[PDB]
């Protein structure tokens, strides 16, 4: 009786959006493998194994039914007790925006917590996190593509309100451009 | 040339049912993450991280093309040598029924063994298992939702014949109610 | 806006084929679980837990849009730094063909490296690998089904050119026979 | 020097009782109840746990301590990473967890690793998320249930009280080392 | 006490020869052939296994035992959980596995952990599923094949025979400790 | 014998300086900076790493060696499998990695396990894939960055130079053991 289909297009962003949204995990916490979602098939592909001896600091993925200036969905880093599998989805609250420039191109990402993790669900601002946790995250993105000669600048994190604007705008943009 | 589709609806229960059936794994042995199947998309979602420091004692999941009084498929706990991934399916023989009341509502589940695990496939009754293994399982369900203030009573396990009745009835019920 | 569908049929073999091809992983490096792809649903199933205390020496899987005399796609063993999940796909370069007879029936398989692993991507011939790595692999296939009374003979590995012929031929065969 | 029996021959550390060395018996997420053998100083499997439960954090004991139960003072250690049995690390106390193990008092220390850059800046159990405490409480309440042993756990007390209990257990250990002469 | 060389300074235990302490060299699922260094008593990587195989259970040896091969009596230990190298645990013997390692007899003990609530109630290898035995047999038959070493494995014998072999190896160890004087 | 402090009481081995025993402090893929405690000879958590990085290979030190930094000579060990902290193994040197850790020279050895059937036949770092070297170089360049410590790493030098550095560090260790008298 039901659809069975493509996580970008066919997974609702969720009724709590943009504050709380569904989020499809591409990469697990601790992974050296950079999975990404194949836009055409909706399968998970290995984009690459990472060039440095680094691992993703948290579960990482994208928000369905979003679109950015790069023609990709909006990416999210999700803090929570446990590692989660590629291809699963979860409910996440935005707590900040991590502004970045990836090879001279804007690529801001959301930092968030899982809304169904009983430890992490009560966070609302990244300022509430331990400052090291930010320094670690910021570093990861600075460093993860260094051995591919790709420069990534990371600025200071911006507040929840700002993140929510980005999500909201990417929802709008998906709905505008996806039809054609 | 083939379908590619929703594990509840589009996976046959299998020609050996109700004695031996297909079974879609939602949660791995040792997992603190409570995955479940999204009824609408057929994706795996994180329902929650568990509130206690407990882990699932075996691979856990549901039987496709079943339905119970709760509008959900019939759940199964699957004993076998190895942990199995969420979203995979396997062949399992019923060896008992574990009667439960979850917050004042009936929620009986099947206890089973993987029919293609060369160690576990020869079990036929849960009485054949070590009594501790039952005590552990029974405990897990008593304890796993305690920190959410949800009470779960677990009674003595009932035999294979009884489990098979439940599976059979849930097959029938799926076929009756799923059309409309 | 996109398909969302069956990895055998709906995943392109890729524009680099037959030299570099997409490859759907069924089994992870180190796994005792023998997953395989369900031809009908495109789900991953447990075919079996292995009968010996052996584990797969590398990520293992099949090439989409291939077909062999056995009515199955062509299988691949993929060397790379990291374990990869069942159901994901990756890009792989052929470096040899591993000729086998599985219970009196031909069942040649490809040996390959991940084209997006920055260590392994520069290999082009299996002769470039350490001879032990071959001896280990060869052994695995000789030994993995022994406890099921299934005899598997493995001959000396043949070069890249030969592997590429097999892939090419299986592409052709898929296109010939899949229509009807 | 020669090889060390960890209970006796590992210094508690310069910053004691506030910040102390700590020997890890059990890893975060383990179902194996390792403990350190009193006689050999090796690691022993005391038992595999009777429930489908796991230690919520790295667990062990403070060396050169002693309690009325004749064992060293136990510690739970919050930190980013799981740690091996047999290793020691530096830990700050941030609270004490009063318990009753079958009528016998068996208080434990809740602590953070002092060399873990995230966790080192915590100083009070109240700084942690309330769920973290709820989960730990429940773990001790539940982990021995299938052995038919009751364990009651009361409200956690501040670091000032923890430091006292640690000091008192250093005194007892010493008092015992004197009674060796 | 001081730190212990596990072979010599770890007691075999009060319940020997039926129930004995046992030092774990290799974890369930490991491809690393750890063994305990005779001289230092540390854990050494003897080798990484030559085939894509893994130890089907936790593996090690009984302390204060000795066999004609000049090594302690080896044990395979069935239990719910994997255990670390260097740890010891309590184990009941439930059978003996006769083998021939390149013409030399090298019998091993099959056992269960006595402190594991599931496995502790097994007393005979015949109580285990026949496949479990088939798999173990094959492991020893196959794990050294890529080193060109033949290992033959015969039908497993009952616990009465296992206990004898254990006793006999305690005698040899003792007989050797006498020949130290 | 009795239990061994691994730095002092573990022989470097018959094949030194070319092939040497080697004590593992840190497992491949670990974020925990274990090191061996100088005084107790136990394993200590020095710290949890400040970046989201992991050791690209098993890491440790050569026993009975000493460098100007007052620590033993460090080794990175390439092999099929991860290895536990506290274990030792046999390793061939195949290159040396010159570094500067905050103005201080802190050269390390790059090596393979000699008992690992795949890796044992490597004899020069140039036989490894260039990316492997790029990754290792970067690891040391980056792993202490969030502690505000600069580490410069220069081009790797051949095994002849590695063997010299090893020999020189055996001399220093010895020279120090003489200065004990």
UniProtKB/TrEMBL annotation, chains A, B, C:
The keyword Magnesium applies. It comes from the Eukaryota. One of its GO terms (molecular function) is inorganic diphosphate phosphatase activity. GO terms for cellular component: cytosol; nucleoplasm. It catalyses: diphosphate + H2O = 2 phosphate + H(+). Its cofactor is Mg(2+). GO terms for biological process: phosphate-containing compound metabolic process. Keywords: Hydrolase, Magnesium, Metal-binding. Its EC number is 3.6.1.1. Belongs to the PPase family. This is inorganic diphosphatase. It comes from Medicago truncatula (Barrel medic).
Automatic annotation (TrEMBL), chains D, E, F:
Keywords: Hydrolase, Magnesium, Metal-binding. One of its GO terms (molecular function) is inorganic diphosphate phosphatase activity. Its EC number is 3.6.1.1. GO terms for cellular component: cytosol; nucleoplasm. It comes from the Eukaryota. Transmembrane segments: none annotated. One of its GO terms (biological process) is phosphate-containing compound metabolic process. Its cofactor is Mg(2+). It is an enzyme of class 3 (hydrolase). It catalyses: diphosphate + H2O = 2 phosphate + H(+). Belongs to the PPase family. This is inorganic diphosphatase. It comes from Medicago truncatula. The chain holds residues 75 to 255 of 257 of the full protein.
């Amino acid at each position: 009786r039901s659809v069975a289909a493509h996580p970008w297009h066919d997974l609702e962003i969720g009724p709590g959006a943009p504050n709380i949204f569904n989020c499809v995990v591409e990469i697990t916490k601790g992974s050296k493998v950079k999975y990404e979602l194949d836009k055409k098939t909706g399968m998970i592909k290995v984009d690459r194994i990472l060039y440095s001896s680094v691992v993703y600091p948290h579960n990482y993925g994208f928000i369905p039914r979003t679109l950015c200036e790069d023609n990709d969905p909006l990416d999210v880093l999700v803090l929570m007790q446990e590692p989660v599998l590629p291809g699963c989805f979860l409910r996440a609250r935005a707590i900040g925006l991590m502004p970045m420039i990836d090879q001279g191109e804007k690529d801001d990402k959301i930092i968030a917590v899982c809304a169904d993790d009983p430890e992490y669900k009560h966070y609302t601002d990244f300022k509430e996190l331990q400052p090291h946790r930010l320094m670690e995250i910021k570093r990861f993105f600075e460093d993860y593509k260094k051995n591919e000669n790709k420069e990534v600048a990371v600025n200071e994190f911006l507040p929840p309100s700002t993140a929510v604007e980005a999500i909201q705008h990417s929802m709008d943009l998906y709905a505008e451009y996806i039809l054609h």
